From a paper:
The hyperthermophilic bacterium Caldicellulosiruptor kristjansonii encodes an unusual enzyme, CkXyn10C-GE15A, which incorporates two catalytic domains, a xylanase and a glucuronoyl esterase, and five carbohydrate-binding modules (CBMs) from families 9 and 22. C. kristjansonii has been shown to grow on a variety of polysaccharides, including cellulose, xylan, starch, and pectin, with an optimal growth temperature of 78 °C. From the N-terminus, CkXyn10C-GE15A consists of two CBM22 domains (CBM22.1 and CBM22.2), a GH10 endo-xylanase (Xyn10C), three [name] domains ([name].1, [name].2, and [name].3), a GE from CE15 (GE15A), a cadherin domain, and two surface layer homology (SLH) domains believed to anchor the protein to the Gram-positive cell wall. Collectively, the results show that all five CBMs have their own distinct binding preferences and appear to complement each other and the catalytic domains in targeting complex cell wall polysaccharides. We have determined the structures of the third [name] domain ([name].3) and the glucuronoyl esterase (GE15A) by X-ray crystallography.
To gain a deeper insight into the molecular determinants for carbohydrate binding of [name].3, we determined the structure using X-ray crystallography. Residue numbers in this section reflect the numbering of the PDB file, where Lys21 corresponds to Lys1071 in the full-length CkGE15A-Xyn10C protein sequence. The putative sugar-binding site was easily identifiable from comparisons with TmCBM9-2, and in [name].3, it is formed by the aromatic residues Tyr89, located on α-helix 2 between β-strands 4 and 5, and Trp191, located on a loop between β-strand 11 and α-helix 4. These contrast the dual tryptophan residues forming the sugar-binding clamp in TmCBM9-2 (Trp71 and Trp175), though the ability of [name].3 to bind various carbohydrates suggests this does not have a negative effect on the carbohydrate recognition for the protein. [name].3 shows metal-binding sites for the three calcium ions similar to those of TmCBM9-2, although the calcium ion near the loop between β-strands 4 and 5 in [name].3 is present at only approximately 50% occupancy. Additionally, although the overall structure of [name].3 is very similar to that of TmCBM9-2, the binding site appears to be much more open in [name].3 compared to a pocketlike site in TmCBM9-2. In TmCBM9-2, the binding site is blocked at one end by Asn172, with the equivalently positioned residue in [name].3 being Gly188 that, due to its small size, does not enclose the binding site. The C-terminal linker region included in the construct is observed as an extended tail seen in [name].3. This tail closely interacts with the tail in a symmetry-related protein molecule, along with the protein surface near the tail of this symmetry-related protein molecule.
Author numbering: 21 to 215
Write the structure that this text describes.
């Protein structure tokens, strides 16, 4: 399905900007297995970037496994041109960041990915910026997926949460991503600053 993303420019610092309170939480509900871990995320776009704010409720954080997706982490997938190919093209992105703000890329230039995290009582927050190469405008559609990897005190992933893909294959197949459609940018956006 489809998330409508409002226009806005947050500060990347792990703190919830006032402007994030004006957009709605998306609740990923595709669980690989039962778990008390849950998550939500918000999206925002500006002329240069897509923005993700994720919060994860997770009472045990573990990142001892050397395999990235076997640590408590969130992953962001983007099909920027909206090709919806069945395998990864040159414009497809798959990024990951753990609760300690350690980032990995499975696809795309990691120089585009800028993140901060914050430890919360019972969980963590990720605030992420992905620099866009195509100029977005109102009505732009991109493919998007969001995933949480939940690891336990055995230092292994025991569960996944997904927004859109229930098949375990977003890492391989962009056509499984959902859609985001960008709206809300003013056309004028001018006039003087009135004090
Ligand atoms: Ca912020
Ligand atoms: Ca693509
Ligand atoms: Ca965990």
């Amino acid at each position: 399905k489809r998330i409508y993303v409002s226009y806005g420019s947050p500060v990347i610092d792990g703190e919830v900007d006032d402007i994030w309170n004006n957009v709605e939480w998306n609740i990923p509900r595709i669980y690989s297995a039962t778990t008390q871990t849950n998550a939500k995320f918000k999206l925002m776009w500006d002329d240069n970037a897509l923005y993700v704010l994720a919060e994860v409720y997770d009472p045990v954080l573990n990142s001892a496994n050397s395999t990235p997706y076997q640590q408590d982490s969130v992953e962001i997938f983007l099909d920027e041109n909206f090709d919806r190919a069945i395998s990864y093209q040159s414009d497809d992105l798959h990024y990951r960041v753990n609760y300690n703000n350690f980032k990995t890329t499975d696809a795309g230039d990691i120089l585009r990915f800028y993140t901060k995290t914050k430890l919360l009582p019972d969980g963590y927050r990720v605030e992420a910026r992905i620099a866009l190469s195509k100029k977005p405008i109102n009505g732009t559609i991109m493919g998007f997926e969001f995933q949480v990897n939940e690891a336990d005190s055995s230092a292994r992933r025991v569960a996944t949460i997904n927004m859109f893909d229930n098949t375990g294959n977003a890492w391989q197949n962009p056509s499984l991503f959902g859609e985001i459609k960008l709206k809300g940018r003013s056309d004028n956006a001018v006039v003087p600053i009135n004090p």
